[PDB]
Symmetry: none
Subunit: 91 residues, 15 copies
């Protein structure tokens, strides 16, 4: 159901351009799950909101991506929209 992926595209939409930069720095820091890794910075600092979707969704499981998304957001994004995603994330 790769569709729920798009719903994650709207995650970076409700946020401002200023906010975007911040999300990057905090991505690396977040606690990850075993059997997974981190993404090399080179492209990450560049990769736009969308680039953070195609590579993100592929790099991280979709079911697992949804959960991972919530974390970072409610921790730094701190937006009511963060939940907006969860609403449709599950189903």
């Amino acid at each position: 159901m790769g569709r729920a992926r798009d719903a994650i595209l709207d995650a970076l939409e409700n946020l401002t351009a200023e906010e975007l930069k911040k999300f990057k720095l905090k991505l690396l820091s977040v606690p990850l799950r075993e059997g997974y890794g981190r993404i090399p910075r080179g492209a990450l600092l560049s990769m736009d909101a969308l680039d953070l979707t195609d590579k993100l969704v592929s790099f991280y499981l979709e079911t697992y991506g949804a959960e991972l998304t919530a974390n970072v957001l409610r921790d730094m994004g701190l937006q009511e929209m963060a939940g907006q995603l969860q609403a449709a994330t599950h189903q």
Copy 2:
């Protein structure tokens, strides 16, 4: 009949630079018609008066855009010029 689109360009002209910022914020809150949606904040906050035309006119119907224009204006802009457009809006 694209031309009338230009007439809208003159709507943001009679308003002060101060007002502009306000108009943006309220744009999101206004009630929309079914079969349509909102515009991502990213570009919107940047997009100047002009940008708010090229993307607005394309995003929203031109016939329907005219009407939409009036709403926001007479609700916040509250300028006599608001009618000025309606004068040229219809024809």
Copy 3:
């Protein structure tokens, strides 16, 4: 005929600087017309006699503005010049 707007500029001219402050305060209290609203105090308390014209004239109809003008004046300003405006207001 935005010209008649100027004549208003001169309404605030025959009045003293002390008078000005007073005019501001009362402006809020006056009975308005449906399909019209009030102006946020922020700018208003700052906005000078001139600012009370550019924004005033824009916010309120010019034809209707002339009338609204007479009211406040003859109610607080109480100046023989109040009528001086009406002289040119109509035409």
Copy 4:
């Protein structure tokens, strides 16, 4: 019903420019709710009345923002307009 957000825009309208500065300082101090946090000072001290809204509303739960609103106001704002929002806040 994000709409009720605008109603909050009018909250900062009835207050003076002087008042504004005060509101900022007190915002930090107010007792908050778990699962939430405070906004980084940098932008806050700059962010205007409208900047407060767009960020405030997003940073805080609209339903919950309405409540949070009342607190600060009736505590420092101390204005009759405070309740003015409430009457509309609920619905």
Copy 5:
């Protein structure tokens, strides 16, 4: 009547360069009909607006392609021009 294909060439003409990248990402996620498949990522990200026509039109039925076109557009593109195509798509 491969002609209607060219009409789709214009679908990507009214959209901005910025928009183009967005369309790509969404293409994959869209619900497809049985008896068909998806296009391999590699070329897809490179393939220009024109490349998305030659390969698209061939990969997808022309009749069926027209419809498929509408979907993606009115869902993400959200442009009044989307209908402009349907206008000629049928004939």
Copy 6:
């Protein structure tokens, strides 16, 4: 003979900073000529004395600009320098 344009630059010189604001407001109201138009308020309110010369002279005919100059001045500027320009204006 673009040079005569400079002489206009000196028009805004003999006038105080307070005066400048006034000139802006009255500019819009003046009776214009055909084939021409008014200048959008946006920039105009910002545009300094200099900005009112580079854009002014370009917007309005130089020959015709000189004449237009005198009008506004003697009507509101009300300065002896007003004629000082007409001196070098004609030639």
Copy 7:
């Protein structure tokens, strides 16, 4: 007599960089002649003042380009330089 094309290059020279963006938006809205068309937006919003000559001159009949140039300019550019071109345009 290609040369006259160059004279057009000078048209976009007397205008500011701010103005340029504007000219773009209007270009599409202007009434065209039968047996002619419009230019796809993609390149247009990118194409510089120069790009608006090479493609413009080629896309539009030179003799016909001159006339077309006048329209847009005097309608939006609103400059005395507009005619400057016409002076040399004809010959």
Copy 8:
């Protein structure tokens, strides 16, 4: 318990505008604690009553700030309200 900081905001409230200027001067003279320092005059002379709270509280420990407050006050402020703070200061 940053809240206690606010109570300090009230310290400068009961005092007149004249007093304020005095408080400033004497702030530099008072004996300080090791592991601490003074605040540069530039901002300090400007910084209003509220500015002497945000920067004061951050600059000086809150627990330690409360004490420091009493000192200066009962020495120059010499007001009954001085103790009024200690009432809330402790707890």
Copy 9:
């Protein structure tokens, strides 16, 4: 344990925009540890509070970065928040 790096992000949060510039200047002057160096000014004058973190943390040891942090702060920052980091810096 990268994370603690983030905690530093909050160090530059409680400080004002004015402060920030200052911090930059002092950074160069602080006594350093052998087997380390300084950062080229170019980026260091542009690099925002965030840029400082990403480059600082990488350029300087994390465990060692924490200590270094406290230094500059208590010396110039002179804030009670300075200690706030420490309390969490260790763990």
Copy 10:
């Protein structure tokens, strides 16, 4: 003797930032020499004091540039430093 060019760099150095803008406007209006032309405004309005130098010099004869410099300065710059250049200009 390219070097003499540098001296001109110091011409724009003794002048204030406020002055710079002024100099720009006047540049266009100055009488020129046959076998030479003017510089397009687009860049000129942006080009800094230095950008003015590199382009000025290349565009205008160095020997002839020195003279040209004096004119504009004594006419508008109206500074004693104007002669300061002449002292080194010749040799």
Copy 11:
């Protein structure tokens, strides 16, 4: 020998704040030398005593500025200090 300029700074020091205003008004009315001009009022009325030094000194010759100083002073300033400057003016 720029230094002698400073001595002029002390010229406006022995005079009261009331005096300052007067000096301004009379500056324009004084007989000037050929090959020199007057200073635009805008800045002048604002430009403080210091501003009158930096701009004056640069505007007028230093050797010539000294003489010019004496004139205005002994004619309006009418102070024994007027000669005080001359004491150091020459050398």
Copy 12:
């Protein structure tokens, strides 16, 4: 005497990268001699400054090339360097 060709290589050297693009557009419009033709745009727009030399020199007579060079430059390039080439072009 091919050599003089290399000297033309230095023509495109003293010019900026921005300038380059301009030179291209103009080349086509220049009045050519009889018994000679124009170069197809395809390669010309790509062909670098070095490509504009190998192809140019071969396409145009070397003796006649030098002359042709001066024209385009002194008409658009408008650089004192233009003559620099001539001085060497001849011999």
Copy 13:
């Protein structure tokens, strides 16, 4: 021993905001040493107390900068804090 530079930072701290403007003006006037020069006014007039430090220190020898500091201060600053720096300048 870079650090000593910081001490110079504190120099501009004990002085008022009014004082600052003065220091600027009298800086250019001071007698300089061989193998050294003055700083262009542009940035200088802007450059704040801190900007003066970063650029001053780099522009002027540190050992020699300390001395230079004393001169200006005791000659215009005329503050007891002037010597305060010296006590720490030497070491």
Copy 14:
């Protein structure tokens, strides 16, 4: 045990895209060992981070490559990650 080579691939991963260009230049300058040499610039400047691994690891002994790696990094890269490699480099 080629594998260790891959770990090197991670070295260029924690560094920014901007950093990369810097690493290149330094590579040439570093002190080398006898029985080896340098790599011809042609490819090197182009060769990406990955290219700097395949060619590097082959051009330089793996065991010896690890050492060489550390050198350049701790000298220019100056990153805490530099040690990160050493951790795994040895084994």
Copy 15:
């Protein structure tokens, strides 16, 4: 001993981004030694601080480059760091 080249890299490090543009302009004007030449402006204006090094060092002798460096710096750079290089330059 190409190593001394790197030290020249550190020459551009202590200078601000603003300064950089300036260095470029002057590089051309500086007196040169026979048997050598100047560098074409094209790349030069683009070429960054680093690009300046790689090309500079190769374009000019390293021994001779060291000296050349000093000139430009102490003449325009005018920084105490200029000597800093000489400290390592010689050896």
